[PDB]
Design a protein around this ligand. Structure first.
Ligand SMILES: *[C@@H]1O[C@H](CO)[C@@H](O[C@@H]2O[C@H](CO)[C@@H](O[C@@H]3O[C@H](CO[C@H]4O[C@H](CO)[C@@H](O)[C@H](O)[C@@H]4O)[C@@H](O)[C@H](O[C@H]4O[C@H](CO)[C@@H](O)[C@H](O)[C@@H]4O)[C@@H]3O)[C@H](O)[C@H]2NC(C)=O)[C@H](O)[C@H]1NC(C)=O
Ligand SMILES: *[C@@H]1O[C@H](CO)[C@@H](O[C@@H]2O[C@H](CO)[C@@H](O[C@@H]3O[C@H](CO[C@H]4O[C@H](CO)[C@@H](O)[C@H](O)[C@@H]4O)[C@@H](O)[C@H](O[C@H]4O[C@H](CO)[C@@H](O)[C@H](O)[C@@H]4O)[C@@H]3O)[C@H](O)[C@H]2NC(C)=O)[C@H](O)[C@H]1NC(C)=O
Ligand SMILES: *[C@@H]1O[C@H](CO)[C@@H](O[C@@H]2O[C@H](CO)[C@@H](O[C@@H]3O[C@H](CO[C@H]4O[C@H](CO)[C@@H](O)[C@H](O)[C@@H]4O)[C@@H](O)[C@H](O[C@H]4O[C@H](CO)[C@@H](O)[C@H](O)[C@@H]4O)[C@@H]3O)[C@H](O)[C@H]2NC(C)=O)[C@H](O)[C@H]1NC(C)=O
Ligand SMILES: *[C@@H]1O[C@H](CO)[C@@H](O[C@@H]2O[C@H](CO)[C@@H](O[C@@H]3O[C@H](CO[C@H]4O[C@H](CO)[C@@H](O)[C@H](O)[C@@H]4O)[C@@H](O)[C@H](O[C@H]4O[C@H](CO)[C@@H](O)[C@H](O)[C@@H]4O)[C@@H]3O)[C@H](O)[C@H]2NC(C)=O)[C@H](O)[C@H]1NC(C)=O
Ligand SMILES: *[C@@H]1O[C@H](CO)[C@@H](O[C@@H]2O[C@H](CO)[C@@H](O[C@@H]3O[C@H](CO)[C@@H](O)[C@H](O)[C@@H]3O)[C@H](O)[C@H]2NC(C)=O)[C@H](O)[C@H]1NC(C)=O
Ligand SMILES: *[C@@H]1O[C@H](CO)[C@@H](O[C@@H]2O[C@H](CO)[C@@H](O[C@@H]3O[C@H](CO)[C@@H](O)[C@H](O)[C@@H]3O)[C@H](O)[C@H]2NC(C)=O)[C@H](O)[C@H]1NC(C)=O
Ligand SMILES: CCOCc1nc2c(N)nc3ccccc3c2n1CC(C)(C)O
Ligand SMILES: CCOCc1nc2c(N)nc3ccccc3c2n1CC(C)(C)O
Ligand SMILES: *[C@@H]1O[C@H](CO)[C@@H](O)[C@H](O)[C@H]1NC(C)=O
Ligand SMILES: *[C@@H]1O[C@H](CO)[C@@H](O)[C@H](O)[C@H]1NC(C)=O
Ligand SMILES: *[C@@H]1O[C@H](CO)[C@@H](O)[C@H](O)[C@H]1NC(C)=O
Ligand SMILES: *[C@@H]1O[C@H](CO)[C@@H](O)[C@H](O)[C@H]1NC(C)=O
Ligand SMILES: *[C@@H]1O[C@H](CO)[C@@H](O)[C@H](O)[C@H]1NC(C)=O
Ligand SMILES: *[C@@H]1O[C@H](CO)[C@@H](O)[C@H](O)[C@H]1NC(C)=O
Ligand SMILES: *[C@@H]1O[C@H](CO)[C@@H](O)[C@H](O)[C@H]1NC(C)=O
Ligand SMILES: *[C@@H]1O[C@H](CO)[C@@H](O)[C@H](O)[C@H]1NC(C)=O
Lengths: 751, 751
């Protein structure tokens, strides 16, 4: 009753099977007949008939995507026997045609990233229960392909269809006779140079229209890009939008617009979000009649509208921006101006809800920072990637014109008002740098090439910063009072400040750490710390988490040196310590005993450790997680039960362990998750995993071990059959290296 | 007659065996009896008896360093049977004593890095042929160890001894009764507070004396450091040096000297190198009477004399520096001053021979650069690691107080006068930055945080730069005219300028490359180049070498994009191309065929390639070296000789190849060096390696293949004996992965 090759899961009272990435050459017939969802994606399967899915009654969803990995053949009516089938995902299979004989039970069908140039009534019209249909990315860029032929009224007969995506195919015309049920319609990069009055008429319900990339703006495009003749603007009929009163989302990005007709929006009182990126809008941003027509708009994206070859002193914002009442986020990137003056943003200052200004990639040399104060609600000021100084490669499921991730890390933003100045030129913070700013809880100074010695006065004008990102500078920590003006500081990120730490001759002072009452998280990673001046110890009463990865503890804890022996002992509250990537061959016993006893989580992974003294765990009563992955360890104690009562998770993967000690797990009742994968194990003995008392072990990962498949391994199989409460993942990757005839086979199949 | 386990090399008409790092548990009995030198270092050997070396007549040299790797037991008289044994290297063996009954034939004995606390007549005084004796690093730092007992008169009887190294042991006094034949005496870090008149009295042959680290300067020490009481200076009697008239080299580093007694040098006409580092000499550097005593001095190291807690405006250089008329290099690092004024260096400007001035690590904010022109001979101006703005962990065989590597890369300095500005704050190069400089052939701007768009005017004042290091900046290459003012430019390093390259939205211009008539070497590595503006090709008629590693050719050569297909074709002179670390899964055939036909050397290593089209090698008539290492490749052609006339070296290591096709070594007469190491080969059939016609192959690397050890290998073993002209290195590392009873065995030992 151990599921193979697939893994069985429990989700919303329905059990699902994950067969993905298992190197399968066909549809496994061992799939449990009770499964409602089946993921076959990323395998070698070359064929599908009506015999593949047999016996599966309740199956509602099948993922066949990315098959074969590195010419999928589907028969006519291969899916026909499946009555309960809802969602079918065929993406990236090199299908020359829409498969015929698809069931009429389909509510969702994704053919994305295939060779299909023909949308036919024969394959489509019969399925009337379709909600979502994904045809995108069949013909695009420099791919060898044909123009998409859409047979007349192929879509007319799906009267339930709420979503249609034809994006990234050669179309040249909006398809006629679209069902009035359409909610979202994606026409992006379809080569449609003209939008008529007739095109969208029947759609009274449209929530979203994507016309983007038709007559694109092609200068400096990171994809093969073909403009309309002379680089003309897309032609939109004055009345093209008259009948869309429900539109929430309009994507006009990269349509080469020099002009917005305000009457496009006349009939769109509720428009939420308008994507205007990659057009020529500098003229419209300055005048902009259409901005009077957008009272409910929450998100405006004007990014990359810059005039080629122009570096203007200031950005010209129309007073009519003040008419955008509901505006939440304003995105202006790639406008390209020299200087931000307080009076240039005047139209934005009265807007009640505007929480976000995105000025990224403007090459801005200077900003009058007092201007953000005069706004009302700003929670996010994103200045990243400017010149501010002191004083298939494309994911088909992603937005094509910008990244969709948060501008600021959620963990920083959740503290309060956020100012992101990262990837700029502020190499020295003077006395007046932060004056007349709002009360900033979240500050990103990352990547400023800052070489200064922070003296304790630099942040006085913004004392309430909780989260400070100083990463990727060259900071010189020469002052014990550094940063201590921020008394409320919770998270401090010092990563990638290695510049001065690497020099033995200059002085290094980390003592300021102890001066914070509320400091919770400190990241010291990749600083190359091997030496400190006069004070060898880190000390904090508050600190919870310390990331020390990417430093040299191999030097600090060198056998001939007593000085750093207590380096972490003074962090009295510490529950999480990351020692990874320290080049550690061995940790001196006394050094390990000096780690804080409060630790619940300890990462020693990705070092060179040949040696671990397990006895020392006796001094860490709270330790739930020990991560030893990526070391050289050849040996396991047999005594672990007397070393720890607390250890829940033990990660040993990618080590040299050749053997599992008799009664390895005897009496260790704490241990839930043991990862033995990617080791030297030849086999596992009877007495190895046997215990008389209770055990909560729920997961054991053996994959990547060179098991000897002779009868010696029989007992382990018998252990596996006896305990099914212990989950063993990727059974297909648990593989017999010997005997010669068993090579490549899974250890779960044997005489 | 294939040598095992050692590899036997021919050196200066003699024969040496390299046995190092072979995991040998004891001394091999198979060593050729004609070998003059034997390196057993870094093995597991735990025992040396008089039966270990039997049969070896002419052995002059034995290296036992680092055994066992992670207590070497040497029996009394073990080495006695070796009459011709001269050099014995016993380093890092944890020897508790000097091994008794060593041969009287020893000229050189190295006991460095052991546990020996007693130097006795029994172990030493009988070796009267000793020239070099190394006892260093036995007791030092926080190591648990004993003060060194040196038995009275122990060295007295060694009348040929020219080199004695006692450094890093606790001595407390110079040993009495040293032989007058001494040339070089190393007493560093021996805890000697006082040097009397008697200590060196009779050594009239001494050319080198090292007293460094005695009464050390401990502030900011990156090792456990114990100062003399009160941090006081070493006490050197006025007459301590009076008889050493031959002294060339004196190391006084870190002796805590406040004052230098000029009479120390009264009798030292030959003194060439003086090391004064890590003392408190700022006063002496200003006054400097002792300088008059050193007109023959070539090298003076004053580095790290800074006064604690002091950041003076100017360096104060005594007029008496003008007296050093033989000075070649002056090292003043870590003096710590703000500004370098032309007058400050006056005393140096008439020194005829001074070619090197080292100003590293002073935190200098500004220099008046015109001063360097008043000098006479300056070839090396080292300004690295300053504040300049726009206008066991210790190697026992290395210098303890500074790196000995060249200040400037020799490839760069060879061109002429060098200015090294690396690791400063020059973030913008203005019109006057480089005015009044000498004719600078070699310029290092690395790690200056420079974000500018170089327009072609920045270097005009130093138009003759041959070698330009721009690495580790954030350069915005926005101008086709960049650098073109340097018309004689030969080597250009742009590595780690990825900042703006990684942003798709900004413009990227590499066209400037073509404007150089003499450009030879170009490093573009780790720039993350995935997109360029309007001009997709790199073109030069001059270029010989191009390093493209760490870029994205996976993106540039993506299937759906034809734009970069010719990217390297326009480099018509190119013989060397590095395509490593481009994340390549495969290379489009036409993209490959557009690689310059002139290539003699091509590196595709460390990509993701599963496919290589060998046929395409036809278009590369000059290709000697193909580097495929670190890929996923499963497949070799059996037709290879059809595709290449020229291929000398083929590196296949770390790939997926499990099989060698029949009749390969047939007809390929060009291939001397083939590396198949770290592949999946189970065996090699007869059929693989046969050829009728000649085969020039001189090396074949098999290590790391899971070899099958049945009689099916006997075919290959047969081949190996029948060709001794093909050397297979690391034979101990060519190891059978089956049968289970044959595991770990080298393939070279079997029935
Ligand atoms: C022009 O502008 C318009 C409007 O801004 C863009 O429309 C958006 O397009 C993107 C990308 O195609 C859509 O993003 C995707 O949304 C999918 C829909 O998810 C819905 O349902 C799920 C679950 O039922 C909900 O969680 C979710 O809230 C939605 O209600 C998601 O399924 C996608 O997620 C998957 O892919 C991403 C990326 O790989 C992964 O991160 C996820 O884990 C997951 O695997 C994705 O988020 C977006 O929905 C569209 N907006 C609207 C309103 O529908 C156009 O793309 C744009 N044109 C171009 C060419 O840029
Ligand atoms: C310097 O070091 C600091 C401190 O570690 C780093 O900052 C932390 O980075 C880690 C990731 O490395 C963050 O941990 C992750 O947080 C994500 C945020 O989740 C929030 O919201 C979700 C719901 O969406 C909640 O579940 C969650 O409680 C949070 O409220 C999580 O999504 C992540 O969980 C996933 O990944 C981890 C493994 O990475 C799994 O264990 C989880 O099961 C799950 O799969 C993860 O927990 C952490 O939040 C950061 N902390 C802070 C203070 O910001 C810096 O990144 C580092 N700096 C540099 C340069 O590296
Ligand atoms: C105080 O100052 C004095 C004077 O500067 C220093 O004396 C020097 O000390 C260093 C390190 O001990 C010596 O450097 C080593 O010299 C060895 C001897 O080489 C001689 O013979 C070989 C051929 O047999 C020639 O190649 C060479 O030119 C010499 O004639 C070298 O063998 C060493 O190189 C080996 O080790 C290094 C480091 O591991 C490797 O990089 C090399 O590849 C090689 O494996 C090494 O170069 C130096 O010779 C001394 N100078 C003199 C004139 O004797 C003191 O070190 C200093 N005190 C302290 C504590 O720093
Ligand atoms: C950007 O890219 C450039 C161009 O590749 C890099 O600069 C080159 O880097 C390599 C080092 O990787 C240099 O090649 C090496 O040259 C050494 C110089 O030796 C000189 O002098 C000796 C005599 O003392 C002569 O034998 C020789 O002809 C030279 O004149 C050699 O010692 C090296 O040989 C050793 O290593 C190589 C493998 O690396 C082996 O093939 C050899 O057998 C031997 O073991 C090596 O050949 C090259 O000279 C540099 N060129 C220039 C123009 O400087 C940059 O480093 C790179 N930038 C960055 C930041 O990475
Ligand atoms: C301060 O600003 C810097 C620079 O803008 C921010 O660094 C950026 O952080 C983002 C989000 O974490 C990174 O994006 C992510 O990269 C990872 C790893 O490849 C990927 O898994 C995610 O999906 C996402 O793409 C981005 O790489 C990084 N940029 C650089 C150049 O460092 C930083 O996050 C900011 N700090 C705060 C507190 O927000
Ligand atoms: C310009 O200045 C920079 C910075 O000072 C120089 O970079 C430095 O180059 C040296 C010499 O190659 C590097 O040291 C070497 O490191 C290797 C690898 O670890 C080691 O095997 C060698 O023994 C040697 O010590 C050093 O890492 C590097 N420093 C930094 C911070 O990047 C550069 O060489 C200069 N360019 C020229 C033309 O001189
Ligand atoms: C040779 C190095 O001597 C120690 C040192 N370390 C630093 C440092 N990390 N930063 C500095 C910044 C400005 C001025 C001096 C220093 C400095 N200094 C110089 C001094 C102020 C005398 O300590
Ligand atoms: C969103 C930016 O689009 C193109 C661009 N690329 C760069 C660049 N690599 N560098 C710049 C430096 C100074 C001023 C402008 C630019 C610039 N610019 C701006 C502009 C001058 C309009 O091209
Ligand atoms: C401002 O936002 C709130 C919700 O956050 C909403 O109730 C209100 O309608 C918004 N005001 C405007 C002018 O849209
Ligand atoms: C830190 O810097 C401030 C300002 O330079 C200074 O007043 C204070 O003395 C410094 N503290 C130290 C050196 O620990
Ligand atoms: C210890 O850590 C916890 C968790 O963050 C925190 O609530 C508590 O205040 C800390 N103790 C001290 C002394 O700051
Ligand atoms: C492990 O540490 C203990 C101290 O609890 C010590 O007695 C023992 O020697 C250590 N074991 C090894 C193998 O070093
Ligand atoms: C030193 O310089 C003078 C000329 O300034 C030159 O004649 C002499 O040859 C040089 N000496 C050495 C040893 O290079
Ligand atoms: C490069 O810069 C120079 C100097 O500013 C300018 O004259 C020239 O037009 C620029 N060339 C370009 C933009 O390619
Ligand atoms: C081609 O390379 C060789 C070797 O560097 C060089 O001599 C020659 O000048 C180069 N050709 C041109 C056109 O510069
Ligand atoms: C190898 O390249 C040649 C072009 O000369 C092409 O005909 C052949 O199909 C290629 N082989 C493969 C497997 O792509």
């Amino acid at each position: 009753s151990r599921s193979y090759p697939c893994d069985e899961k429990k989700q919303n009272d329905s059990v699902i099977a994950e067969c993905s990435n298992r190197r399968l050459q066909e549809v496994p017939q061992t799939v449990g007949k009770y499964v409602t969802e089946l993921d076959l994606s990323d395998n070698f399967i070359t064929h599908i008939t009506n015999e593949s899915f047999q016996g599966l009654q309740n199956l509602t969803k099948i993922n066949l995507n990315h098959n074969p990995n590195v010419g999928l053949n589907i028969t006519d009516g291969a899916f026909l026997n499946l009555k309960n089938l809802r969602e079918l995902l065929l993406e990236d299979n090199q299908l020359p045609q829409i498969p015929s004989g698809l069931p009429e039970s389909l509510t969702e069908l994704s053919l994305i990233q295939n060779n299909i140039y023909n949308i036919t009534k024969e394959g489509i019209s019969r399925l009337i229960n379709l909600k979502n249909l994904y045809l995108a990315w069949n013909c695009y860029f420099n791919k060898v392909c044909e123009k998409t032929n859409i047979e007349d009224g192929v879509f007319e007969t799906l009267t339930n269809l709420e979503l249609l995506s034809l994006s990234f195919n050669s179309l040249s015309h909006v398809p006629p006779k679209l069902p009035s049920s359409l909610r979202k319609l994606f026409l992006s990069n379809t080569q449609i140079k003209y939008i008529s009055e007739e095109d969208f008429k029947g759609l009274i319900n449209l929530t979203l229209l994507d016309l983007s990339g038709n007559c694109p703006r092609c200068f400096n495009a990171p994809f093969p890009c073909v403009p309309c003749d002379g680089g003309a603007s897309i032609n939109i009929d004055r009345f093209a939008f008259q009948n869309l009163t429900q539109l929430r989302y309009l994507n006009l990005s990269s349509t080469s617009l020099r002009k917005i007709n305000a009457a496009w929006f006349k009939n769109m009182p509720h428009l939420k979000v308008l994507d205007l990126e990659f057009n020529y809008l500098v003229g419209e941003i300055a005048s902009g009649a259409f901005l009077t027509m957008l009272p409910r708009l929450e998100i405006l994206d004007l990014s990359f509208n810059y005039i080629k070859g122009s570096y203007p002193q200031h950005i010209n914002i129309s007073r009519n921006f003040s008419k955008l009442l509901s505006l939440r986020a304003l995105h202006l990137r790639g406008y390209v101006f020299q200087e931000l003056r307080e009076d240039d943003f005047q139209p934005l200052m009265q807007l009640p809800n505007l929480s976000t200004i995105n000025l990224g990639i403007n090459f801005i040399k200077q900003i009058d920072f007092k201007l953000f104060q005069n706004f009302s609600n700003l929670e996010i000021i994103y200045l990243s990637e400017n010149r501010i100084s002191p004083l298939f490669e494309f994911d088909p499921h992603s937005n094509f014109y910008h990244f969709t991730r948060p501008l600021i890390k959620p963990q920083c933003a959740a503290y309060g008002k956020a100012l992101d100045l990262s990837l700029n030129s502020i190499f020295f913070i003077g006395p007046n740098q932060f004056e007349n700013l709002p009360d900033i809880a979240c500050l990103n100074l990352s990547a400023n090439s800052n070489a200064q010695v922070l003296s304790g006065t630099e942040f006085s004008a913004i004392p309430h910063v909780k989260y400070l990102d100083l990463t990727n500078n060259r900071l010189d920590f020469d002052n014990a009072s550094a940063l201590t003006e921020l008394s409320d500081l919770e998270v401090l990120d010092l990563s990638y400040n290695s510049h001065y730490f690497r020099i033995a001759g200059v002085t290094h002072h980390l003592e300021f750490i102890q001066n914070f009452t509320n400091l919770k998280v400190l990241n010291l990673s990749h600083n190359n710390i091997y030496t400190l001046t006069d004070k060898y110890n880190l000390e904090s009463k508050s600190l919870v988490e310390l990331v020390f990865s990417g430093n040299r503890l191999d030097i600090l804890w060198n056998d001939d040196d007593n000085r750093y022996i207590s380096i972490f002992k003074g962090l009295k509250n510490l529950t999480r310590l990351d020692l990874s990537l320290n080049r550690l061959k061995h940790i001196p016993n006394e050094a390990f005993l000096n780690l804080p006893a409060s630790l619940t989580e300890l990462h020693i992974n990705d070092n060179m450790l040949k040696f671990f003294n397990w006895t020392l765990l006796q001094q860490f009563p709270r330790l739930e997680l020990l991560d030893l992955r990526g070391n050289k360890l050849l040996f396991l104690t047999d005594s672990l039960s007397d070393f720890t009562s607390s250890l829940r998770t033990l990660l040993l993967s990618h080590n040299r362990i050749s053997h599992l000690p008799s009664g390895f797990l005897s009496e260790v009742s704490s241990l839930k998750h043991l990862d033995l994968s990617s080791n030297l194990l030849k086999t596992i003995n009877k007495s190895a995993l046997e215990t008389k008392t209770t055990t909560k072990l729920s997961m054991l990962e053996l994959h990547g071990n060179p098991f000897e498949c002779t009868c010696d391994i029989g007992d382990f199989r018998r252990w596996m059959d006896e305990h099914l409460n212990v989950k063993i993942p990727r059974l297909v990757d648990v593989i017999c290296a010997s005997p010669g005839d068993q090579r490549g086979k899974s250890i779960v199949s044997l005489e």
